[PDB]
């Protein structure tokens, strides 16, 4: 008996059906948590290839015909690869080497977006910014950003206080090392009673050799102090020791007195 046959209309694929995961390394890498990145139809044999390329993601079968998507679950970026730069958000691992650019057979590893807005880098950078590995740009920006730490929760705030105690202990031993001169400077720019108090504590803890070399404006000689009583203005306004001093090594009292010298219109000294 005859049958009324009819073929369906020709298929018209959408953008999703034409997606190829092997072309989307720059689409998948910036993906965030709770975000589905559709990658199109994926054959069964290419599932391990995709899952090993993106271990931080879960491969989800979203629709028929093998339609799949990737959902970021975590960030596996390590401190030495994420903390010593502010511009690299991810990197690729292949044959034991680390590269900024993608290559077939590599494994994606991504950094937390807030890795420098929290204290997740304080431990690694506390050691890296000492000694020969000191990078002036990265380390100054690290210390400076800690003062305006965007993580204002009780945890980001507490990690900030833990870092201050470590820097206070370290810089009390020697405040001349570059990371400590930067910490003293940023305390000065913060301009609070706590930061000023920590400055005086660190500088007063220094050795006699440090004070004789850098803090002669704070500790004048007998003849210098006795002569300064003959003038009405503060000693810091005329003392050559204070005009040649490193402002990061001045006690808070001396630093405040430097801005009380009555500058005549123009240059007043």
């Amino acid at each position, epitope marked *: 008996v005859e049958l009324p046959k009819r073929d369906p209309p020709p298929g018209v694929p959408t953008d999703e059906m034409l997606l190829n995961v092997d072309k989307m390394h720059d689409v998948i890498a910036p993906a965030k948590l709770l975000e589905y990145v559709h990658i199109g139809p994926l054959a069964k044999d290419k599932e391990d290839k995709v899952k090993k390329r993106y271990p931080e993601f879960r491969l989800v079968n979203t629709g028929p015909g093998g339609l799949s998507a990737l959902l970021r679950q975590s960030y596996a970026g390590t401190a030495p690869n994420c903390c010593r730069t502010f511009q690299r958000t991810h990197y690729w691992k292949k044959d034991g080497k680390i590269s900024d650019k993608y290559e077939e057979g590599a494994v994606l590893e991504s950094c937390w977006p807030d890795v420098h807005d929290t204290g997740k880098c304080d431990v690694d950078l506390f050691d890296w910014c000492q000694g020969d590995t000191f990078d002036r740009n990265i380390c100054h920006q690290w210390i400076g950003s800690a003062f305006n730490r965007a993580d204002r929760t009780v945890e980001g705030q507490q990690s900030l206080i833990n870092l201050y105690n470590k820097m206070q202990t370290l810089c009390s031993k020697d405040a001349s090392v570059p990371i400590c001169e930067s910490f003293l400077h940023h305390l000065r720019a913060h301009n609070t009673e706590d930061s000023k108090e920590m400055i005086d504590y660190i500088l007063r803890q220094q050795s006699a050799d440090f*004070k004789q070399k850098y803090m002669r404006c*704070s500790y004048p000689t*007998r003849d210098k*102090l006795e002569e*300064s*009583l003959k003038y*009405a203005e*503060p000693r810091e306004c005329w003392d050559p020791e204070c005009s040649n001093a490193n402002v990061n090594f001045l006690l808070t009292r001396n630093y405040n*007195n430097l801005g009380l010298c009555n500058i005549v219109r123009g240059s007043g000294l």
Partner: nanobody
Amino acid sequence: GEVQLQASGGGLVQPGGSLRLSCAASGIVFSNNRMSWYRQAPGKQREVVATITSGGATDYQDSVEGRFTISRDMAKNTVYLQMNSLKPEDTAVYFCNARRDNFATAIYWGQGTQVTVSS
């Protein structure tokens, strides 16, 4: 005559204690002078310990920096010297001193008070 700079507040205290010295000036206005606390150990020249300008800026001797603090009260016209963490080498006679801003000849010295620290 009648330029009085009497110092008080001294005494005897074990090393580690504290003293607050006073100097209520008369015949002299602080908004016009620089006040300075001196001290003189037995058989030794006088040395300045702390000072304060007519504007209020302070300065200290290095061996007392952080331990001593010099303040002023413009209303009471009295200059103070808070002494903390007194070390045995602080034993001396502490006295007031007033020096005009630009009138150098008008300098005045005060009557000291005894500060002694020992066991």
